[PDB]
Amino acid sequence: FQLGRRIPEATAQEGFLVRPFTQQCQIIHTEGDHAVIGVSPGNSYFSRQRLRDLGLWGLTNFDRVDFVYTDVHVAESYEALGDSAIEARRKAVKNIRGVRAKITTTVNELDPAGARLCVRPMSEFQSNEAYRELHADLLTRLKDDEDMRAVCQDLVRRFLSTKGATATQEQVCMDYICAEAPLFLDTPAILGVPSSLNCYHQSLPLAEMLYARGSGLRASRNQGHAIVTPD
């Protein structure tokens, strides 16, 4: 249930349906500067074949493509689901090795020279100054603004109710989403590209806020989101 006025529909491209979240995201998709293909560890959707298909779709449609796999708050999520701390870390380490390796093989196969397609962990952005400024700003607004925070908690509970939940599961999920958020706000600032489309096979839980009309916390005018699913 999207809140904008001319909701884009999906365009079929190299085996995917690409659905930009707003009309302005569709302009960014058409610019073809940059895509982030976010990848979650422990998620069987990201098979070797699906990653290859994504990487081919990406290089066909953008000048540059960055696969970014989430490697932060993974052990914490497994603990919040009931694993011991030791076993949560064991499984996080295993799932993070598997997704890193599948992506790395993909990228070596498609772009041996590392010219257009790159993979990196989400934690690598912790030393990026724009990422750090985006993250701190987001945390400060949540701390300072309880109405904005309440909207984000509702969006977290909606997202968890699909995948009820405890306070701990909510808090860890908020942490996990806050850590990805700078790439959903301003990948152009973090990666130095003209514009960027942040792509996933489900809409981002905070999309309704970050890509909305009005004012508040909003993604950069050069940042877009698309939902990208197999045709």
118 annotated ligand-binding residue? no
What does the alpha-carbon distance between residue 95 and residue 176 come to, in Å, rounded to a whole number? 16
- Kindly name the residue from 40, 77, 203, 220 that is annotated as catalytic: 40
Give the Cβ contact number of residue 64 at 10 Å. Answer: 18
101 annotated ligand-binding residue? no
Give the Cβ contact number of residue 127 at 10 Å. Answer: 8
45 annotated ligand-binding residue? no
211 annotated ligand-binding residue? no
What does the alpha-carbon distance between residue 57 and residue 14 come to, in Å, rounded to a whole number? 6
Cβ atoms of 50 and 102 within 8 Å: the answer is no
DSSP 72-112: SSHHHHHHHTT--HHHHHHHHHHHHHHHHHHHHHHHHHH-T
109 annotated ligand-binding residue? no
Give the Cβ contact number of residue 156 at 10 Å. Answer: 21
- Reply yes or no on whether 40 is catalytic: yes
Angle at alpha carbon of residue 37, lines to 110 and 29, rounded to 5°: 100
What radius of gyration, in Å, describes the C-alpha atoms of the chain?
Answer: 17
37 annotated ligand-binding residue? no
180 annotated ligand-binding residue? yes
Binding residues for substrate: 43, 176-180, 200
Catalytic residues: 40
